[PDB]
Amino acid sequence: KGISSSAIPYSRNAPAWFKLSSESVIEQIVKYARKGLTPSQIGVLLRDAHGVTQARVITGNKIMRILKSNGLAPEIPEDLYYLIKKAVSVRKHLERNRKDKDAKFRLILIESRIHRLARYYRTVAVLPPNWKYE
């Protein structure tokens, strides 16, 4: 295990060089989401190019709440969606060539990780119960 994460500043204010509007950021957010990017991609594009540090600080609330209150909710949370599509990519690799025992092992690991947070999201009922991973 390694310690490599991001270090959120002690400040909770806009950084006083951020001369943009607190609403034009939201309009850019919903524009990028409607052209089709995941919320982590919205956050990293907004951070890199239109220099909002983080939008829970600069806007009102966090950007998945912004997308759900502006009508662009996800069908399934981003974590579960990315783990689902990684699992189905490994499954198509396994149907293609069937002597990859290591990739079978990594499929068992990815499927366990699917079930863990699918169980969490189900008891929170973000997604409905009787959800199965096909």
Partner: peptide
């Protein structure tokens, strides 16, 4: 720029209606 043709409520609603279209 990156992708998505999925994962959103409106996007999977539009692709389900696209299955209804054909």
């Amino acid at each position: 720029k990156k992708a998505k043709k999925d994962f959103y409520r409106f996007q999977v609603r539009e692709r389900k209606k696209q299955e209804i279209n054909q």
